[PDB]
């Protein structure tokens, strides 16, 4: 209604401000590090 | 009885040193990370190969730590 000061009301977040993933991008570097870590095992099967 | 509280530096994970990742209790974030690494069920059920895969997970901080860095994509 009509108010002079201190509306004291909560609000929802701003529309579309929560952006999200979707694009068909390549693997994360944590996965790249797991590939390299498992390679240290695979190479060792053919090495001393 | 109860589970051991020691996994505080790791996470929720269906892996065991005897038979590997139990695919019936295996988490979806785990299967995700492993497919992009090119791992097959034969390797996840390899108690030898699954150990190498799991040793990386408990290193970074567990299932939670790998997820935080997976979420970058």
Curated annotation (Swiss-Prot), chain B:
**Residue numbers of the full-length protein present here:** 207 to 275 of 505
The function of this protein is:
Regulates actin polymerization by stimulating the actin-nucleating activity of the Arp2/3 complex. Involved in various processes, such as mitosis and cytokinesis, via its role in the regulation of actin polymerization. Together with CDC42, involved in the extension and maintenance of the formation of thin, actin-rich surface projections called filopodia. In addition to its role in the cytoplasm, also plays a role in the nucleus by regulating gene transcription, probably by promoting nuclear actin polymerization.
What positions does the domain CRIB occupy? 5-14
| Places the protein is found | Cytoplasm, Cytoskeleton; Nucleus; Cytoplasm
Question: Which gene is this protein's source?
Answer: WASL
Q: Which residues carry this modification: Phosphotyrosine?
A: 54
The organism is Homo sapiens
Recite the lineage of the species.
Answer: Eukaryota, Metazoa, Chordata, Craniata, Vertebrata
Q: Tell me which residues bear Phosphoserine.
A: 40
Q: What is this protein called?
A: Actin nucleation-promoting factor WASL
**How does the annotation summarize its subunit structure?**
Binds actin and the Arp2/3 complex. Interacts with CDC42. Interacts with FCHSD1. Interacts with FCHSD2. Binds to SH3 domains of GRB2. Interacts with the C-terminal SH3 domain of DNMBP. Interacts with SNX9. Interacts with the WW domains of PRPF40A/FBP11. Interacts with PTK2/FAK1. Interacts with PACSIN1, PACSIN2 and PACSIN3. Interacts with NOSTRIN. Binds to TNK2. Interacts with SNX33. Interacts with NONO (via second RRM domain); the interaction is direct. Component of a multiprotein complex with NONO and SFPQ; associates with the complex via direct interaction with NONO.
